[PDB]
Amino acid sequence: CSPGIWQLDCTHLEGKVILVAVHVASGYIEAEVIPAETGQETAYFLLKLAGRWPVKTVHTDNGSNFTSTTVKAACWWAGIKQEFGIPYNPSMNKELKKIIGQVRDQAEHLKTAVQMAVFIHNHKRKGYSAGERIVDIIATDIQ
Amino acid sequence: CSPGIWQLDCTHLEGKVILVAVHVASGYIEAEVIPAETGQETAYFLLKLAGRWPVKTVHTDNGSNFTSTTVKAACWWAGIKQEFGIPYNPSMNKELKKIIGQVRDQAEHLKTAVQMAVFIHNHKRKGYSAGERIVDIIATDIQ
Ligand SMILES: Cc1cc(C(=O)NC2CCCCCC2)c2c(c1[C@H](OC(C)(C)C)C(=O)O)[C@]1(CC2)CC[C@@H](C)CC1
Numbered sequence: 001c002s003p004g005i006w007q008l009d010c011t012h013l014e015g016k017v018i019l020v021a022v023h024v025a026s027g028y029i030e031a032e033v034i035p036a037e038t039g040q041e042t043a044y045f046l047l048k049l050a051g052r053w054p055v056k057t058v059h060t061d062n063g064s065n066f067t068s069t070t071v072k073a074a075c076w077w078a079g080i081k082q083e084f085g086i087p088y089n090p091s092m093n094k095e096l097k098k099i100i101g102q103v104r105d106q107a108e109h110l111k112t113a114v115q116m117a118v119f120i121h122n123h124k125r126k127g128y129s130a131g132e133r134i135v136d137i138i139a140t141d142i143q
Numbered sequence: 144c145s146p147g148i149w150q151l152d153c154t155h156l157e158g159k160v161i162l163v164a165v166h167v168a169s170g171y172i173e174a175e176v177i178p179a180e181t182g183q184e185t186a187y188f189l190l191k192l193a194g195r196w197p198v199k200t201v202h203t204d205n206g207s208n209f210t211s212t213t214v215k216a217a218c219w220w221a222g223i224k225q226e227f228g229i230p231y232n233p234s235m236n237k238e239l240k241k242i243i244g245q246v247r248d249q250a251e252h253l254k255t256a257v258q259m260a261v262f263i264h265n266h267k268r269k270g271y272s273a274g275e276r277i278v279d280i281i282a283t284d285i286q
């Protein structure tokens with residue numbers, strides 16, 4: 001997979017919304033609890049992500065996520081296009097919920113447990129970790 | 144400078160608080176508006192940062208920032224130590240305020256303009272950009 005492709009999806013836990021972004025080529029994840037599943041939260045999240053990584057295309061399992069003018073304006077400003085090379089055929093959201101449950105009792109707030117789970121996931125040895133693979137993929141792509 | 148050293152500081156604009164983290168070796172920045180200048184916001188921010196980058200030591204220009212038990216617990220869990228190799232002698236916070244002012248009229252909310260400014264800063268050509276330098280520094284360090 002190309003080094004600039006990211007997938008964004010929302011999942012639900014404890015009555016709250018978790019926005020999950022996956023760097024498809026490496027398995028690296030960024031995730032955050034958001035108050036509402038809205039175009040404004042999505043747009044703000046995409047702007048943050050694009051300022052930290054070289055985001056070229058974005059995919060999702062719910063295409064209606066990207067219909068708001070707010071999201072479109074954010075993609076426009078950051079130069080993000082929609083991904084079309086990933087067919088929809090009806091993963092880590094469940095594996096991420098697994099880690100959250102493992103650490104949930106260590107934190108009061110769900111948003112804390114989510115970041116603990118992101119940390120665990122990105123640094124776990126699978127023989128590099130996801131965090132190691134993304135930087136080497138993007139670094140190699142620069143050259 | 145070592146590839147795992149980050150500097151964290153808060154600055155103020157429009158009556159709000161902006162938390163600014165700098166990867167000292169590359170100039171790469173992450174920044175966010177936070178509601179209050181509190182140990183809980185600092186701790187949560189450090190947990191997010193450490194799950195995304197290999198954070199080994201953290202420095203600051205206001206040492207009292209790191210006295211709360213909440214921050215200490217976060218550093219403990221993520222394995223972060225305090226940096227001692229950067230003497231205090233009384234930069235980018237001003238350069239970042241410069242970019243914010245340049246784009247401020249393009250967004251309603253300050254928090255949006257901040258992320259726009261982070262994007263501009265990390266992708267500006269200075270002949271690589273900060274975003275390119277951090278990944279190559281960390282990738283080279285893995286090997
Ligand atoms: C709200 C809250 C409060 C405290 C706190 O001040 N506890 C004191 C400690 C001193 C001795 C006992 C008296 C109680 C702590 C956390 C949190 C956490 O929320 C934030 C991320 C800070 C926003 C949460 O969601 O629970 C930690 C540990 C300490 C943060 C680090 C993390 C790995 C584990 C959870």
Ligand SMILES: Cc1cc(C(=O)NC2CCCCCC2)c2c(c1[C@H](OC(C)(C)C)C(=O)O)[C@]1(CC2)CC[C@@H](C)CC1
Nearest residue numbers: 040041043044069070073074077249250251252253255
């Ligand atoms: C709150 C808000 C609302 C709208 C919006 O829905 N405008 C519509 C567009 C359709 C046509 C005119 C009618 C009005 C827009 C933004 C924001 C922004 O706050 C968030 C990041 C989304 C949380 C802000 O702080 O202003 C953007 C552009 C569009 C986001 C992208 C960014 C590069 C520039 C600012």
